[PDB]
Structures are given as structure tokens and as C-alpha cells.
Structure 1
């Protein structure tokens, strides 16, 4: 009732998913029959750069690499539900992959929003079902021109506006380390698939952490570039024309060198000609390969989200190993974080009170992983305001987010956009006054229980700050939760004692052994330097 259309969409989506997996399995079995000899485990454990080298040299055939990864992806999907669709014609793309491409023969996984000709990009939304893309988005075209073979679409939380990973069409994606845990999101299918060995390279998008959450939660590396470093042309989205806080797309992979190779392959004449709106900045190898001592700003906490004990240890140990390696570590925290999060980020993301975003959910189910976000956004402006006034004395954080999610005039949007611009210049000035090269920060972890990110909005603080600032930011795994880390979490209080702090403690319970990351940041357009820094952390923390 009011859900007949949504129910029919889910029924067809599930049958498409099921038929996709069956097709993959058929293809894999056929291949294995003809190739009983192939050492599949050796092939799967090769770091991407080595895989690429052997594909370029002919030591490994693209078919062997393709079907071996296809088989692994099908297998790890069993326990994770990360795959929504097999990009069918990728078998033919395989046979015609450009031979001198930088990614020749490399199977690549795609977050579902990367439009692929002939396939839906549903984003888990009933209204996007049965609407196959007319063509590949630009970054998909460039991947193919560089010889890569995009082979699957991976799951996202409904609408993508979430750091969990469930929707009413394909269901819930689970963390491959612990099935009761979220894989993070919104690029959570990617995180789960790459984190379990089913893909050597993937693409995600990030507006509040959506590349970094799943990378950290699933123990892999991820980079969110400056928003306009790579082309978003052709991507499927759910809000259009919101430019205060820009969406960014970037790579996810098992190591830092893979992220660098992916960026190098994307930043080519092909991309710059297909999307003239992206500045034609080539990948600067000399910056990325540099090995000079860095001035590293760092903070153990943002005073907003109290770090978990494992987060704090991860940060301090990384700081200490960097110092031992000759880098200079400088205490540094961007000024006015609560304003950046509550006023600028929230205000920019929801300038219209959520009406545009809400159009997506009309007649649809609302996935439990979204929590009360939809119900809150639907509230009348006067009531959001009233409710905010009431909450303010007891729970200022909740009050602040709520008041800043109201609709406003174009006049007020200009003012907010100007404040965003000035805040960016403020942090840049602060940075330059300490002469920083890069910035090391905590990263949210370990993974939260399924269906809890929707109830812990405050915890986007570590990531969304750099969307607001539009600085490149990436994450690197550096440790795993210990018994002691996990025991200490039982004393966690947070700085506010509101529902978000309380949920986080419970949602992080039972995490021994899960991966924990740190975040590496550089200035706008300095992706190469940001990756150089990530590489240094990777060398020191996972030797």
C-alpha cells in the first residue's frame, strides 16, 4: 500500500542480482575446467603492481586474471553481499583491452553509482530501478581506455547518504572481518569486496567520508582527492546542484601504491578531453616519489568525537614511528571544528531542508540503516526550529545539527557559501603559519555494528571536516584492536553524553582483531604529496 511499485522494484532487482551471480559462477566453472593447473592463490595474493607487471609482460593472461578474480568475488560475496550486478559484456572488454594501457588486464570493481552502459544505478532507490544507463560515465570510459576491465557494481546504503551499507533492493552488505559489523559506507560494497580479496582495485565517492569509512572499517587503503581532481561526469546521484560541499571520487585498494597507479592512469589526456571541466593536472611522479623529511601536523582528538582507545593508540603509535623516522611532528588542530561540522557542512548538505534529497524517497521504503534521517528531514521548518530550541540546553550538538538542517533563501545560501570559502582560507592560513607539509589525524574505527552508523551521526566529524575544507584525505590501516583497547572502550564516555556518544560505545563493542586506520591530509590539489605521506605511514606501520 503505497509500496506496490517499490515492492516490484525490489523483486526485479533481487532476481537480476541472483541471475548476475549465477552467470559469474557459470563463467568461472567453465574457466576452471579448462584450467585445472592455474595457481589461483598465487595470482590472488600478488600485489596489484606486480599483477600489472605480469599482465604487461605476458607472464599472466588477462583471462586467467579475470576469471580468477571473478571466482574470488563470487566466493567472498557469499558472506558479504557486496555485489549487486555483474557488468556482463566485460568479457568482451577483456578481449579488446588496450595493450599499452597502464591498467591492462586489471579487473576493477565499481561502486554502483558509476554509470555503466545497459545497467541500472539504483542507489537502492525504487525510483532508479529499470532505468539502465545510456552510456559509461567518463571515469569508466577512461578505465577502459587504460585497459582495465570493470567487472561488478558493488552495494551502497540506500541513496548513498550514509556510512552504513543497506538498501531495500539488494539488502545489507556485511563486514568481511565480522558479519555483525558494518563494512562502512557509502562505498561499503567496495570496502567489503577489496577487503576480502575479491578485487585488486575499486572506485568510490565521498561527501562526508564515504571512501574513508569503508576503507578503514574493512582494513584497506582509500583516497578522497580534492573534489574536482577527477571527473564526476556521468555519475548517478541523488541531489543535484548542491555545490557548497562538493562530492569527490577516488580509489580504494589493498595498498598505497595501487592508489597512486590508479590516479596516474585516470589523470591522462583521455580524461581531460572527455571532461574539459576538470583541470588537466597530470600526476606529478616526482612529488609522489619524494622521500624528504616532512613537517607533520597531528591531533589525537578533534574534541568532538572522543576517539576510541584503539583510534588514539593508532594515532600515537604512527606519530611516534614518524618521529623516529626523522619527520617533525607538530601539534595542530583546525580551528572552529564545531562550526565547520554543524553550520558549514550540515548547512551546505541540507541548505534546502532536505526537500531535494527527500524526492528520492517518495513512495519508497526507508532502509533501517538510515535511522531517523528521513523522518527528521520531513519535519516542517518551524518544528525543526522549535525542537532545536528545546534540545539546546541538554543536548547542544543535536540541537545544532537540527537547526542547521532547515530550508533557507538563496540569499542565505550565498552567505553560507561565502563562509565556507573564508573558513577554507582560515585553515589554510593556520596551516601555513605552522609551515606544515601534511596533517595526521585519527580515523573512525573500529567498525560499528550493522545499523548503527545511522544513529551515530556525530562520528562523521573526523572525515566530513575535509569534505567541508575540500582537502585531499586518505586512510591507511595501521593496527588492529587489542583486548586492552577493547576493554578500555567499555569506559568510553564521549564529550557530550548525548545519544550519539552512547550509541558509539555500544556499536563498537566486541571488536578485538578489527582493523584501525589513521587519516592523512594535504592541501588542495596535493594528492601526490598526500599519497607520499600515506606511503610513509604504510612503510612504518605495516612493515
Structure 2
């Protein structure tokens, strides 16, 4: 009965969305009258490096590449529901774009949390509706300064604490390969859009896998750098001052070269001048372009989330293809993964028991795809500890998350923050002892059914670990689900048998033809190495 403002918020958001799309369309069709004989699917097809080349040499005009992609985005949006807003003024930015910039005339999609002047960054929440950004976030300024034309705000799951992608304002985003499936999240609108040719390049945030999931589920590249490689200034979030598990932002694109282009474009003196709290580490092209044989750690499971057959096959086929290229593959597994997930990561994100998070939800509709998170955090802490002590014998994995989602005293979070530092060094010591360069990893895939990710929390294990360690981690699509793999899904039993295993069992069925990826990891500040290795995987696993 107190959803007055929630119902009103949503109505405004949908008309703002509808007006954006209607504006986008009447823009595109104006253009197509004056540009009929023009090779739009050669343009949309063109890889980004190609595209910048023609924009810089002046073979294609910026308006052509803008209004061609603008049309395509609008078309793919009809199946997917992945464009929140059309960024108003981008037509004006196109004409006054910095001409010798590294992304001159490249149109760029932005996850909604990236502040853009005059536009809401709602995060699917009614409390953030009707509250336009006073100015562009630091990375958007650098984008615009480097010649790019940010043009849409792509959708996110309510609060971004979910690897599905629905909210009560703009509704549910769907996977462009199969509309019964989730596109991933929280950068789901990004993946859906880029993954269907709606944008050559875009920007996401990751805190539990939120770049890597949608990249994998929608079959594109994506990199989560080290937390403070790039400027978090101006990004809209649920919680501020949680530093233990640090959020990280990075690129999402159709290929690995695009990603390396994009970092090289942002890591410049503009970024470091505009935000001196970021360490002025220039993009080292020498390391990215190296062809030195790699010592590559690997594991085909984390013993926590049982991989799908597709994942397992993707991991082994890459492992072996890499061996044939001459890289040295070494079995490697970080110590105490259950501890990192159940105690450290979970404790880090909900150190305060959720009370900060939850005030975003007061008087709002709770999206079904958040599952039982809001209800669980809303429970009082004595009931969490009691209920944990009952479940532990029967369901340790679930009892352990519950035990570490209670509020704690400043003394206890100092102790947790120390264990994270020590754990990070603990895994670095494993790494250095086996002299590895990079680390090959499975990656959750194929894409889950809709409203499944919310009730399959174990499956964050593959990605979350490296938010916890704060290692640069990216994904590359390597293969597509065979019927042989989809059939092998009915022998899937999981390592625990609790409901997260059961939900994801069914969630991952009926996924023939969907893409499946692997994860690449490096030590901190070695983003350029992570991309060298991702690029290697990309070359060796193309069909």
C-alpha cells in the first residue's frame, strides 16, 4: 500500500525510455533518406580497430558510423530491452569531437551507473529517479576527451547486486542469442547490446563478476582490471566506503584488441590529471604485444561450483590448444576458496549486515531476480545466527553465507580487512612459487535461465574470487554449447547438492548453441599481460 512513489517512478522511467527510443528512431530514419546507398552491414561488421582507422583517415564520416550503429542498437533493443536512455546531446558531441583522439567518432555504450550530465543513473531504484547527474563521471569525460561519442545508458538489475538483469523501472533485459536466458549481470544491457552488434565498445563495473558474466553469457570480451587502475569518481552506487572488496570498472567489446584500445585510450594524462588518486601507470604496449611463451596456471574446477560440461570442455580445449602453441600449462588452485567466498568476500560486501544496502529499497518494489537477498538481509542478526547454526550440518554452504551476512563491530571489520590483505599475499606466494605469468580458469556458462541467478549464489565462485584477491581478470568466448554437452547436463550433480546446485542444474539446461567462455587472470597491475594472454586464447580458439 506504500508504493505510491514506486508506481510513479516506474511510469516516468518508461516514458523517458520510450521517448529516447522514439527520438533515436526518428533520428536514424532522417539519416537513411539522405544516405540510402551506404553499406550499413559492412560498417556494423567492421571490427573496432578497422573502424577507428577509417574514422581517423576519413574514409567514413562520424555521422555515418554514429547513425548506422544508432539504428542497429534500436533494432536489437526490440528483442532485448537493453537501452534505458538515449544520451540527448551525443549528436552535438559528434560534431565537436576531439579530432586527433584515439577513439575519434567511436560511439560508446555506458552502463547506467556511469553518471552522464542531465540523465538519471537510477540503478533500477525508485529513490534515484528524477535526480539527473550534475556532470559526467571522470571516465566519461576522458572518453569524450579522447574523441568518443557516448550515446546510450544500458540496463542493470535493481541495485547491481545480481548477475541477472531486471528492475521495476525498465523491466527485464534478455539474452540476444535466446530470449529465455539471462544476458548476465549487472552489466547485462551492455552485453546484450554489444553481443548483438548494437555497440562496438562499452563500459561496465564488476564487483562479483559483473563484467565477466554478461561478456560470457552474451559471447563477447570483457576485462575487470585491478580496482584502482581506473577512476571510480562519478559512478553511481548503492553503498559507499566499503573498501574490503573493491569495485572495479573496465571495458566490454566484441574482441580483445578493442579492449586493449580502450584502456590505452583511458590511461592517459587526462584521467590522471582529472583524478590524481589513480596511479599514473601508462598502458604498456610492449607487454601487450609480446609473444614470449607463458607459464600458465590452470584448474578445470574450483571444487565449489561444479562446472557445466561446456565449461569443462572449453577449459580443456583451450588448455591443450595453448600447450600446442608452446605455453607451459601447470595445475594451480588458490588455497581456501570457500573461506574467500563465504567468509571474506561475503563478509566484505555485507560487513554491516546489509543496512546500508537496504535503505536504497525502503518503500520500493523488490525485483524477483534479486531472489532472497533483500529478504535475507532484512532478517535480524540473532535470527541469522540461529538459523545458520541449524542449517550448518545440513547445508554448510548456505549456513556459512548466512553467518557472514550479519553486522559487525569496527574491530571485527579491521580483522576481516587484514585477512584479505594476508590472503592476497598468500595466493601471490603460491603464484610466485610456481613462477606463473598468468592463470587460466573456467567461467560460469552457458547463460542461466531468467530469474535463476538470484537463487544460484554459489556460481559467483569463479569470478568473485578475483574481486576478493583484486587481480585483473577477463573473459574470452572459446566455444558454443553442443547438444552432447547439453545432454551431459542431466548427469550434473554439484559438489554440495543444496538448492544453489539444483537451481543452476536446471538453469543451465536448454542452452544448445549458446557461447561459453574461459577466464584469464594475472597479478595486480598487469592488465596488459592479462590482455596479451586473452588475445592468445582469442587467436587459438576462433573457428
TM-score range, shorter chain: over 0.9
Take 1:206 and 1:372, find their aligned partners in 2: how far apart are those partners?
A: 21
Take 2:50 and 2:514, find their aligned partners in 1: how far apart are those partners?
A: 27
Take 1:272 and 1:440, find their aligned partners in 2: how far apart are those partners?
A: 31
Matched, 1:124 2:124: yes
Take 2:208 and 2:298, find their aligned partners in 1: how far apart are those partners?
A: 20
Take 2:122 and 2:132, find their aligned partners in 1: how far apart are those partners?
A: 9
Query: Residues 378-423 of structure 1: CA distance to partner in whole angstroms, max 9, x if unpaired?
Result: 1100000000001001100000000000000000000000000000
Shift of 1:467: 0.1
Partner residue in 1 for 2:385: 385
Partner residue in 1 for 2:14: 14
Shift of 1:20: 0.3
Take 2:339 and 2:236, find their aligned partners in 1: how far apart are those partners?
A: 30
Report the 3-state secondary structure (helix = DSSP H, G, I; strand = E; otherwise coil) of the residue aligned with 2:229.
coil
Shift of 1:101: 0.2
Take 1:508 and 1:233, find their aligned partners in 2: how far apart are those partners?
A: 37
Query: Residues 55-85 of structure 1: CA distance to partner in whole angstroms, max 9, x if unpaired?
Result: 0000000000000000000000000000000
Query: Residues 516-536 of structure 1: CA distance to partner in whole angstroms, max 9, x if unpaired?
Result: 000000000000000000000
Count, aligned residues: 543
Report the 3-state secondary structure (helix = DSSP H, G, I; strand = E; otherwise coil) of the residue aligned with 2:291.
coil
Query: Residues 94-114 of structure 1: CA distance to partner in whole angstroms, max 9, x if unpaired?
Result: 001011000000000000000
Partner residue in 2 for 1:157: 157
How well do the aligned residues superpose, as a CA RMSD in angstroms?
Answer: 0.4
Query: Residues 358-386 of structure 1: CA distance to partner in whole angstroms, max 9, x if unpaired?
Result: 01000000001101100000110000000
Shift of 1:339: 0.2
Shift of 1:451: 0.5
Take 1:422 and 1:315, find their aligned partners in 2: how far apart are those partners?
A: 29
Partner residue in 2 for 1:257: 257
Take 1:207 and 1:94, find their aligned partners in 2: how far apart are those partners?
A: 32
Take 2:24 and 2:243, find their aligned partners in 1: how far apart are those partners?
A: 39
Shift of 1:486: 0.3
Shift of 1:293: 0.1
Take 2:429 and 2:491, find their aligned partners in 1: how far apart are those partners?
A: 38
Partner residue in 2 for 1:329: 329
Take 1:244 and 1:493, find their aligned partners in 2: how far apart are those partners?
A: 33
Take 2:451 and 2:274, find their aligned partners in 1: how far apart are those partners?
A: 39
Take 2:417 and 2:371, find their aligned partners in 1: how far apart are those partners?
A: 28
Take 2:243 and 2:193, find their aligned partners in 1: how far apart are those partners?
A: 31
Shift of 1:509: 1.1
Take 1:150 and 1:37, find their aligned partners in 2: how far apart are those partners?
A: 26
Shift of 1:136: 0.2
Shift of 1:498: 0.2
Partner residue in 2 for 1:75: 75
Partner residue in 2 for 1:423: 423
Take 2:219 and 2:431, find their aligned partners in 1: how far apart are those partners?
A: 29
Take 1:504 and 1:208, find their aligned partners in 2: how far apart are those partners?
A: 17
Take 1:291 and 1:357, find their aligned partners in 2: how far apart are those partners?
A: 45
Partner residue in 2 for 1:219: 219
Take 1:542 and 1:494, find their aligned partners in 2: how far apart are those partners?
A: 30
Partner residue in 2 for 1:445: 445
Report the 3-state secondary structure (helix = DSSP H, G, I; strand = E; otherwise coil) of the residue aligned with 1:228.
helix
Take 2:358 and 2:449, find their aligned partners in 1: how far apart are those partners?
A: 26
Take 1:502 and 1:142, find their aligned partners in 2: how far apart are those partners?
A: 45
Report the 3-state secondary structure (helix = DSSP H, G, I; strand = E; otherwise coil) of the residue aligned with 2:11.
helix
Shift of 1:307: 0.3
Matched, 1:358 2:371: no
Report the 3-state secondary structure (helix = DSSP H, G, I; strand = E; otherwise coil) of the residue aligned with 1:358.
helix
Take 2:238 and 2:393, find their aligned partners in 1: how far apart are those partners?
A: 35
Query: Residues 473-530 of structure 1: CA distance to partner in whole angstroms, max 9, x if unpaired?
Result: 0000000000110000111000000000000110011000000000000000000000
Take 2:342 and 2:431, find their aligned partners in 1: how far apart are those partners?
A: 22
Take 1:235 and 1:310, find their aligned partners in 2: how far apart are those partners?
A: 35
Take 1:350 and 1:371, find their aligned partners in 2: how far apart are those partners?
A: 16
Take 2:139 and 2:27, find their aligned partners in 1: how far apart are those partners?
A: 26
Q: Which runs of 5+ in 1 are unaligned?
A: none
Partner residue in 1 for 2:291: 291
Take 1:249 and 1:336, find their aligned partners in 2: how far apart are those partners?
A: 26
Take 1:53 and 1:490, find their aligned partners in 2: how far apart are those partners?
A: 48
Query: Residues 432-480 of structure 1: CA distance to partner in whole angstroms, max 9, x if unpaired?
Result: 0000000000000000000000000000000000000000000000000
Take 1:542 and 1:206, find their aligned partners in 2: how far apart are those partners?
A: 26
Take 2:177 and 2:280, find their aligned partners in 1: how far apart are those partners?
A: 39
Take 1:335 and 1:2, find their aligned partners in 2: how far apart are those partners?
A: 48
Shift of 1:537: 0.1
Report the 3-state secondary structure (helix = DSSP H, G, I; strand = E; otherwise coil) of the residue aligned with 1:352.
coil
Q: Which runs of 5+ in 2 are unaligned?
A: none
Query: Residues 203-242 of structure 1: CA distance to partner in whole angstroms, max 9, x if unpaired?
Result: 0000000000000000000000000000010111110100
Partner residue in 2 for 1:433: 433
4+ aligned runs moved over 6 Å, structure 1: none
